[PDB]
Amino acid sequence: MVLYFIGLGLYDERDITVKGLEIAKKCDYVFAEFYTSLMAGTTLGRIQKLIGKEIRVLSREDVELNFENIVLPLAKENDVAFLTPGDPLVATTHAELRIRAKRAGVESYVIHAPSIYSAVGITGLHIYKFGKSATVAYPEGNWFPTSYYDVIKENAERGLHTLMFLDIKAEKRMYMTANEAMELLLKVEDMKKGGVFTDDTLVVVLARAGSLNPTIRAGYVKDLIREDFGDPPHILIVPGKLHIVEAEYLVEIAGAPREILRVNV
C-alpha cells in the first residue's frame, strides 16, 4: 500500500542515503529509471548487489505513459520503491507521478538524496546567486533551439549564475561534453550577437560531482574550450558577477586564472 520515491544520489552506489537504502531493502518490489540521468560511477549490478533486491528498470515510456499500470498496481498490496539518480522529483515530470499515486489510492513518500542542484555548491559559487536553470540541447535538422542562451543573458544581467545541464541520450549512452556545449554557445552568440557568451566569458566546469575526486575547473572559454575535463557527465556554469570570495575559491580550488580576481569581480 506504499510507494517510495528514493533518490540514488550523484555518482555511485554509495550515494544513496542510509534511510533510502534501509527502506529499499524492505520493499517487495524495486523499480528504477536511468533515462533522466545515469550513475556514471557505478553499474546497475553494483546498485543491485548493494540493495540486495532485483531492480526492474523502466524506460521513459514505461514511466511517462504507464506508471499507473506497471508500478502503482503492485503498490496496492506491497511496499514499492522507485529509484532515480539524484534527488527524487527534481526531474520536471516526476512530481506529477505523486498525483497519479494519489488517484490510485496509493500513499507515497519521498526519500531525498544529493542533487547536482545543491552539489554545484562545491564550485564555490554561492547557492543563492543561481538563477533560472537551463538545458543545452543539440540542434537537429531544421531545428536550432537557443533558449538556454537567453537564460544565461537574463541571469547574468542580474548578476546571477546559470546552471546548465548538457544534453544526454541515456539509452544510446551518448553525452554532450562541456567542450561541445561551449562550441554550441559560441555558435549561438554568432547568430544573436547578444554579447552573452564569447571567448572572454568566464565559465566553470564540474564533472563527476559526488565522486571523491571530481573535476572542478574555471577559466575563460578561449582556454577551456579544448581542455579535457575527463569522463562525463559534464556540468557547465556561466557565473554572473563574482563575489571576491567566490573568485578566490575558483582560483585556489578550481585553478582559475588570477585574472578573474580583477576582471570578474
Place this chain on the structure above:
Amino acid sequence: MVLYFIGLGLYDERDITVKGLEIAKKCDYVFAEFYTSLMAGTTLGRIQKLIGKEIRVLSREDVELNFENIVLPLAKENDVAFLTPGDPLVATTHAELRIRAKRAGVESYVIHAPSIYSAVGITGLHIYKFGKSATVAYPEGNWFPTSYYDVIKENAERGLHTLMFLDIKAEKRMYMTANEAMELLLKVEDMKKGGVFTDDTLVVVLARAGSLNPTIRAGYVKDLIREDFGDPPHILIVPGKLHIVEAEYLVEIAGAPREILRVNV
C-alpha cells in the same frame, strides 16, 4: 592527513549518504556544527551512535574564527571529518574553509547529502524555474533587513519562483517560522508598497523536509499566515507564474485552493 566535509542530510541521522557514513566511521577525529540549520528528527547522541565516534560540536565563533586552530592542526596527522546539517556548502560559508585547509597544506574532500535547495522539488514546483534565492533575517534593534523583498520582486517579474531560507539563532534555539516570515514581508510591503507580497499572494510552505511526513502547504497569505505548520525548520516559497501541472500538484498534494488551477497565462 585529510579533512572530510561531510553533510548529514535534512531531518535525521539516516539522511547521511552511505558514502558519508562509511568514511565518517573511519575518521580519527570528528567535529561538527549545528548552527547553520536544524535537523529536527535526531540528536547528537543518535548521530554519535550511528557513526561510532565522539563528536566535538563547534560554535559559529569556533569555526569562523578558529577553524584553522581547532580542526586543521589534527588533519595534518589524522583523518578528520567536519559534519554539518544538509549539504555542507549550501547557503553556508563553509566553502571558504577549503581555502583555509589548502593554505595549511591539508587536502579536503566533500561528501554531499540531501539539501533543502533540491528538496523543494517535493513542492511540485519545477526546480529549474527557481530564480535568485533569499534569506529572511530577524530584525534586530533598529536594523530591519528587507533585501529579500526585492529578490521576490525581481523573480516574480521574470515569472520565476523564489526560495526563501529562514533565519536561525541556534544558540538561542530560535528558528524562524514561515508565519513569522510572512508577517515580516507584509510589514516590508506596507513600507515599499510594490504589490510584491500581500494577503492575496500565493505562497508555499515546506516544513521538516526529509521527514516521512513533511508539511507541504500552498495557499494565500491571508489564509496561511496563522496556520500551524508544525515544528521548525521551515522555508517559504513565493511561486511565480505556475505551469498547469505545478498548480495541479499544489492543489492535489499541498491542498491549495482549487481556484489556482486556473492560471492567468
